[PDB]
């Protein structure tokens, strides 16, 4: 049975189905709420290398979608445009009525290629991809999502700025995926797991104001010199 | 069962977003043609970890996933909107789905004021 | 609240159309292959303004629009079929969603024949 | 909360949610009914010029559809085929399972062009477009609809002829829309708000039987000479 | 009504397939990415004709078709998933949709232990 | 009203709606079940000639789908690929989320042509086409289905092998339909109603091991020489 949360003795609890509490009062369907909570809040690494390793392709499993009524402002969200090396799309278009997650401080937009050995892309840990009040078992193409999980509750009776960070990827969804952070269409930075969103934006501004952008028609790629707390608490550059 | 948070960390503050169905609009803002776009229908709030509610919710949603995923595997509905209504029906059947034996444990009827009214007569 | 018709006019007669779910068919007309096409599934009726019901209905539907539109804005369901079932559930929770205190105002239990049966004993 | 109608003291009323009436009996879901009532019945002008001014285009608002079980025979319905001047369609195809309003004395079929500055066409007064037992916030292409509003009720426990009138339109949905009533593919009448459906049909028959149809390959357009009760109660012609 | 099987034959044994929503998975099999494909989510069972249940079911489903088809004709929902939930609501309204008159025939309240507790006092 | 089955006095019964049985206990929605039962079980002929005569094409009736939770292992299922003589498809593609019936001992895959005078193909006796936990009033293209009917129940409170048999058909859905059983792409057997699935498989193996396959580039068709119990209880060949 699907667990239902309830407050007894100043503590959240799972309601015992085999037990009947007549003191529990449910006076309207408005007391029942479905909520979505972000994996961020549990302390999972949110950098693009770590986050993409949690997803994978699989065939033979029909996608499923479940509704949820309230969600959490996310620090990190993701938006994927992945093709196979022959240009065929890897992810399906967003079904009618499915929009991106509504509150994202940083949207990590990843574009690139991979083998995509499977009809749909699932969460390897069983979590959901959270969209605008709909949770899916699979990733949709070019649609912003947060990783999360859903809860169901009995309530007791009684600005916003977003920033897009673009990445190029090769060998997406494999053991040896390569990631480049995009400054402009001809200037990239070799991406490490340790690079935070705030550091990528300061790296982009300092590159723009130092003239370290490509002033030819070819690709310029930088590599940052090598020189434990969550978010709520070629060439070289040294 | 009690909720045992077993996650590596917990953001104890819940900055949340949702919608309001009741919201009495100002003038003509309820008309879809004049009202907000999809991006501007949300309300926000902030909830702290009083009674450890926030860290319990993070742990509750985590423990809900297995049962929820098994429920979605066994349904043929592409988008499921009926879980909370089915829980409301189940709440009523658990209490009123059989004959209600007064003073029994599976019947939520209080004959207190009725037993005292009879004693007064 | 009472229904105050505030429209410029009122057609007091309601020539209506609907379907019937129960309709015991004649022979084999219930088989989709043999039965009526989409255009021929309707029944008709005519209702006059006794008790001012018709003009109230025109005014009731007008006053329903705001709440209804705000409900549709906040749902992600593309086509909503569940409003009347949710109202039936809410009708039951309003009455049976807590412990029923007999002779209290929020409990619809009548101990009349039970109180007289005890007096006879 | 969505209001619910109920009969107390020989009068329809809105049920008080904060008040509990144990004498109110709901014994089956069959006692609950959703009904649709036509704006016609409230006295709104139903002529094509007046009716189209109540609709408008808007982007960023997802369409929504709600079911209703019983409806009212309409005198006037509408069926739109609107393209932009570049031939792209302005209204979307009817979704699967959405059919035209089932009882219409007169269907005003309007074909023409307009700027269509918006993804979908909404009712400016917040009313609905009533289809076959489905109410939509937006107009679908080539699908017959009546303007109306929905009510929800607790019931207390216990031929058909249609005529199509065709119009051509330019500058649809603007301050200066022009309308022509169509006699045949080469004969039109300059349209006024005061022209009723019955008058348009008698104007069409008298034109057919007077020989006032175009007997060339070009367009003939007539203008009727200038020579307060609801429905339930170039060249010139003088 | 009683169930009168009027079919030319009856397979009295019912080899059936279904799914289980509760099924406590072994380890990580509940994760869609790791779990069974669409073809491998089914469980099986075999039921014999004790109490003539199997032949009654074949006759019951046959007699259900007319009402069911007429219900589908009158709905605009493309795929209907709500019949059993609507029957559960109707079960509750039949019992609790009005004032419950104790000892009356349309009220399922038992004052047995309450009537004896009063006699003891 | 839709009948509901219930067990009283060791017998299945239809619940009386106008009668209230307080001894009947419904403690959770899990006690309610929808089940699907195969026409096979009632003794209908399951051979391809007899089975296809029960289906027919009709326009103007919208298709409808109803869910069911448990089904019966079928001996016979059917899978149709029917085109008109001009190559246009006769049956619609399976809607998203509709899969074939999950347990079929023999799948009779029929390919051919017919007039297909109707938008959709219905069951002439009012039965359903049973798919994976969804019952439809119409046949979908290339999707395996069993013929069946649905029941609704109140429960009282408390390997698999499949074989495909291919047929070619001409004049599908008429008085004079011709059927050929397919051995390979160039060898067929004139089909009779009396030929059981087990007999068709033994006829195929004996043809393969006797060398009676076509060893040219043209069609070879055999006709079996002429030389009352249900399943649970050119050239010639003599
Ligand atoms: C609910 O919360 C649970 C606890 O927070 C989540 O459990 C996670 O489950 C996944 C698998 O489903 C584990 O990932 C596996 O890890 C092992 C080895 O662990 C490696 O990573 C840890 C980091 O915690 C590190 O300390 C070790 O030294 C290993 O390097 C791999 O062999 C597997 O292939 C797989 O990657 C997580 O480790 C585990 N997290 C924790 C904190 O235990 C559970 O997934 C949550 N459920 C949902 C639906 O979100
Ligand atoms: C429910 O019923 C209400 C009353 O019948 C409806 O109210 C209507 O609301 C719309 C706007 O939402 C009004 O239209 C506006 O009118 C003003 C000026 O009024 C002009 O038209 C009136 C005709 O009544 C005329 O007498 C005046 O001299 C003006 O020429 C404009 O400035 C606005 O831009 C807008 O067009 C209607 O006037 C109003 N009707 C009435 C009778 O008051 C309400 O819309 C209904 N709700 C639904 C959902 O149908
Ligand atoms: C529920 O069970 C009922 C009884 O088993 C099913 O009744 C079947 O209804 C169909 C029509 O809907 C009948 O078919 C018609 O048959 C007549 C003449 O009968 C011919 O076939 C019988 C074989 O039983 C044979 O004995 C006769 O000599 C005739 O050759 C035709 O004229 C019609 O055109 C039509 O084909 C079935 O005969 C009838 N079966 C029985 C056993 O009575 C009913 O269809 C079931 N409902 C569902 C939804 O499955
Ligand atoms: N129409 C109104 C009805 C009440 C509704 N309120 C909520 O949706 C809460 C508002 C806040 C935050 C909360 C939440 C959001 C995201 C993720 C998890 C939870 C949602 C939980 C909530 C709560 C949870 C547990 C116990 C008590 C309250 C408090 C309810 C607002 C609209
Ligand atoms: N299966 C049967 C159950 C009863 C059902 N009947 C209605 O659908 C009414 C039949 C008529 C007209 C009415 C209506 C139609 C269109 C618009 C508005 C209302 C619909 C309202 C109704 C009514 C309204 C208010 C109080 C009492 C009755 C009377 C019910 C017929 C089928
Ligand atoms: N989560 C669990 C809840 C109980 C569930 N069990 C059924 O789905 C039955 C399991 C068997 C067979 C039966 C059936 C299958 C196909 C067609 C018709 C009937 C389905 C009927 C059933 C039954 C019918 C009538 C009376 C009593 C039992 C017995 C129930 C298994 C999963
Ligand atoms: C790469 O993937 C293959 C197969 O998935 C595996 O054998 C190998 O260990 C992986 N890692 C590296 C570094 O090659
Ligand atoms: C960069 O590339 C994208 C996609 O290739 C393109 O849409 C965009 O206009 C480009 N920007 C510039 C400044 O050329
Ligand atoms: C990088 O810096 C330039 C300079 O202001 C800015 O215009 C651009 O948007 C920045 N890129 C990102 C991803 O913020
Ligand atoms: C041109 O590119 C070189 C190398 O990337 C860089 O050093 C130089 O500053 C650029 N030009 C300007 C004007 O910044
Ligand atoms: C036409 O529309 C414009 C802008 O919408 C407006 O300025 C003007 O008043 C309208 N009417 C006429 C007669 O131009
Ligand atoms: C009139 O025009 C329409 C559409 O252009 C066409 O379908 C119809 O056949 C025409 N009628 C005649 C009589 O030409
Ligand atoms: C106009 O009159 C002719 C003459 O009978 C008729 O055939 C035609 O249908 C009429 N048009 C309309 C719109 O009624
Ligand atoms: C031809 O057209 C003219 C002008 O429209 C009209 O007067 C005349 O009657 C028409 N011919 C016939 C035969 O009616
Ligand atoms: C063939 O079909 C036609 C019309 O459907 C009918 O007249 C005839 O009896 C049928 N049978 C044969 C053997 O022609
Ligand atoms: C037989 O025909 C089918 C379809 O025409 C084709 O897919 C298959 O490969 C063929 N088999 C052989 C052995 O040629
Ligand atoms: C016919 O026999 C051959 C010989 O083994 C076999 O390969 C083939 O699958 C058989 N066909 C069917 C439909 O079983
Ligand atoms: C070739 O075909 C003939 C006729 O179908 C058959 O008699 C013969 O056995 C076939 N060849 C072989 C090697 O089986």
Task: Write a three-state SS string for D157-199.
Answer: CCCCCCEEEEEEEECCCCCCCEEEEEEECCEEEECCCCCCHHH
In 3D, which of D72, D74, D73 has the Cα closest to residue D36?
D72
- Kindly report the number of other CB atoms within 10 A of residue A41's CB atom: 27
Q: Are D15 and D106 members of one domain?
A: yes
Confirm whether D165 is domain-assigned. Answer: no
In 3D, which of D53, B69, B89 has the Cα closest to residue A137?
B69
Resolution of the structure in the document, Å = 2.8
Q: Residue B112 corresponds to which tokens in the numbers above?
A: 């207190």
Q: Residue D11 corresponds to which tokens in the numbers above?
A: 């009068």
Interface test with C, best of F96, F124, F139 (most C CBs within 10 A): F124
Environment class of residue C19 by beta-carbon count within 10 Å: exposed (0-12), middle (13-18) or buried (19+)?
Answer: middle
How far apart are the C-alpha atoms of B46 and B17, rounded to whole Å? 9
CB contact under 8 A, D102 and C17: yes
Strands annotated E in C1-121: 14-18, 43-47, 79-80, 100-101, 109-110
DSSP element (H, E) containing A236: strand A236-237
From residue A89, alpha-carbon distances to A94, A116, B12, C9, D171 in Å are 13, 9, 40, 58, 40
Q: Are F158 and F100 in contact (CB under 8 A)?
A: no
Q: Are D129 and D137 in contact (CB under 8 A)?
A: yes
Q: Which residue in chain C has the smallest CA separation from D159? A: C44
Whether the CA torsion A70, A73, A76, A78 is positive or negative: it is positive
How far apart are the C-alpha atoms of B79 and C24, rounded to whole Å? 34
Strands F163-170 and D11-14: unpaired
Q: Are E22 and F78 in contact (CB under 8 A)?
A: no
Q: Are D41 and D147 members of one domain?
A: yes
* D55 strand-pairing partners: D123
The three-state DSSP-derived secondary structure of D22-47 is CCCCCCCHHHEEEEEEEHHHHCCCCC
* Residues 6+ away with beta carbon under 8 Å from E96: B92, B96, C92, C95, C96
* Residues 6+ away with beta carbon under 8 Å from C90: A28, A29
Confirm whether F160 is domain-assigned. Answer: no
Confirm whether A161 is domain-assigned. Answer: no
Integer distance in angstroms from the first to the last C-alpha of chain E?
46
How far apart are the C-alpha atoms of E92 and D100, rounded to whole Å? 37
The finding on whether A149 has its CB within 6 A of some atom of ligand 1 is yes
> Tell me, what DSSP letter sits at residue A42?
G
Ligand 15 geometric centre to CA of B53 (Å): 75
Number of domains in chain D: 2
- Kindly report the number of other CB atoms within 10 A of residue F234's CB atom: 8
From residue E12, alpha-carbon distances to A31, D219, E18, F104, F120 in Å are 47, 76, 19, 19, 34
DSSP F108-124: EEEEEE----SSEEEET
Helix, strand, coil abundance in chain A, percent, nearest 5 = 10, 40, 50
Q: Which residue in chain F has the smallest CA separation from C29? A: F126
Q: Are A14 and A107 members of one domain?
A: yes
Q: What angle do CA A140, A145, A146 make, to 5 degrees?
A: 140
Q: Which residue in chain A has the smallest CA separation from E41? A: A61
> Which residue range is the domain that position A112 belongs to?
5-154
Q: Are E64 and F2 in contact (CB under 8 A)?
A: yes
How far apart are the C-alpha atoms of F235 and F219, rounded to whole Å? 11
Could you tell me where the DSSP H helices lie in chain D?
Answer: 48-52, 197-210
Q: Are A12 and A112 members of one domain?
A: yes
Q: Are A13 and A125 members of one domain?
A: yes
Q: Are D27 and D137 members of one domain?
A: yes
* D121 strand-pairing partners: D57
- Kindly report the number of other CB atoms within 10 A of residue D212's CB atom: 16
- φ/ψ region of A173 (left if φ > 0, alpha if ψ in -120 to 50, else beta) reads left
Q: Give chain E's length.
A: 121
Instruction: Report helix, strand or coil for D145.
Output: strand
Half-sphere exposure of C109 (CA within 13 A, CB side): 25
CB contact under 8 A, E110 and B93: no
Q: Are A51 and A132 members of one domain?
A: yes
In 3D, which of D59, D116, D109 has the Cα closest to residue D85?
D116
Q: Residue B43 corresponds to which tokens in the numbers above?
A: 């309300």
Query: Among A119, A154, A189, which residue terminates a domain?
Result: A154
Q: Residue C43 corresponds to which tokens in the numbers above?
A: 């029944």
How far apart are the C-alpha atoms of A206 and D90, rounded to whole Å? 47
Q: Are F22 and F114 members of one domain?
A: yes
* Residues 6+ away with beta carbon under 8 Å from F172: F52, F82, F90, F110, F112, F113, F114, F116
Q: Are F79 and F34 members of one domain?
A: yes
In 3D, which of D198, D199, D179, D201 has the Cα closest to residue D190?
D179
Q: Residue F148 corresponds to which tokens in the numbers above?
A: 């069946």
Environment class of residue C21 by beta-carbon count within 10 Å: exposed (0-12), middle (13-18) or buried (19+)?
Answer: middle
Q: Are A14 and A91 members of one domain?
A: yes
Q: Residue B87 corresponds to which tokens in the numbers above?
A: 């829980």
DSSP F113-175: E----SSEEEETTS-EEE-SSEEESBPPTT--BEEEEEEEEEPPP-----EEEEEEEESTTSS
In the numeric block, the tokens 């043209």 are attached to: F218
Q: Are F14 and F99 members of one domain?
A: yes
> Tell me, what DSSP letter sits at residue F223?
E
Angle between helices B112-120 and C112-120 (to 10 degrees): 40
Residue having the nearest C-alpha atom to atom 14 of ligand 11: D175
Q: Residue B17 corresponds to which tokens in the numbers above?
A: 């977003």
Q: Are D150 and D188 members of one domain?
A: no
How far apart are the C-alpha atoms of A81 and A94, rounded to whole Å? 12
Contacts of residue A12 in chain B, CB cutoff 8 Å? 3, 51-53, 56-57, 60
CB contact under 8 A, C81 and D67: yes
How far apart are the C-alpha atoms of E62 and F221, rounded to whole Å? 40
């Amino acid at each position: 049975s699907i667990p239902l949360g309830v407050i007894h003795n100043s503590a959240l609890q799972v309601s015992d189905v085999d037990k009947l509490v007549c003191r529990d009062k449910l006076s309207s369907t408005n007391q029942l709420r479905s909520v979505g909570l972000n994996l961020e809040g549990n302390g999972v690494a949110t950098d693009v290398p770590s986050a993409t390793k949690r997803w994978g392709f699989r065939s033979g499993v029909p996608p499923k979608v479940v509704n949820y009524e309230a969600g959490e402002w996310a620090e990190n969200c993701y938006n994927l445009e992945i093709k196979k090396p022959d240009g065929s799309e890897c992810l399906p278009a967003a079904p009618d009525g499915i929009r991106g997650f509504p509150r994202c401080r940083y949207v990590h937009k990843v574009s690139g290629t991979g083998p995509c050995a499977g009809d749909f892309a699932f969460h390897k840990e069983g979590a959901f991809f959270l969209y605008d009040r709909l949770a899916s078992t699979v990733i949709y193409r070019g649609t912003t999502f947060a990783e999360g999980v859903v809860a169901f509750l009995i309530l007791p009776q009684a600005g916003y700025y977003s920033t897009t960070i673009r990445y190029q990827a090769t060998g997406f969804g494999t053991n040896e995926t390569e990631y480049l952070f995009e400054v402009d269409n001809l200037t990239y930075v070799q991406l490490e797991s340790r690079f935070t969103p705030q550091f990528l934006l300061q790296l982009n501004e300092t590159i723009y104001t130092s003239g370290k952008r490509s002033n030819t028609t070819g690709k310029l790629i930088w590599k940052v010199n090598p020189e434990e707390w969550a978010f709520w608490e070629x060439x070289x550059x040294x | 069962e009690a909720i045992v948070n077993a996650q590596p960390k917990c953001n104890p503050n819940l900055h949340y977003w949702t919608t309001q169905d009741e919201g009495a609009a100002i003038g003509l803002a309820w008309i879809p043609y004049f009202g907000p776009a999809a991006e501007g229908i949300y309300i926000e709030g902030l909830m702290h970890n009083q009674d450890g509610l926030i860290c319990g919710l993070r742990q509750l949603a985590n423990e809900t996933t297995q049962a929820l995923q098994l429920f979605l595997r066994a349904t043929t509905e592409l988008r499921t909107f009926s879980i909370l209504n089915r829980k409301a029906i189940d709440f009523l059947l658990q209490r009123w789905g059989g004959t209600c034996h007064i003073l029994g444990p599976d019947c939520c009827i209080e004959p207190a004021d009725w037993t005292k009214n009879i004693t007064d007569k």
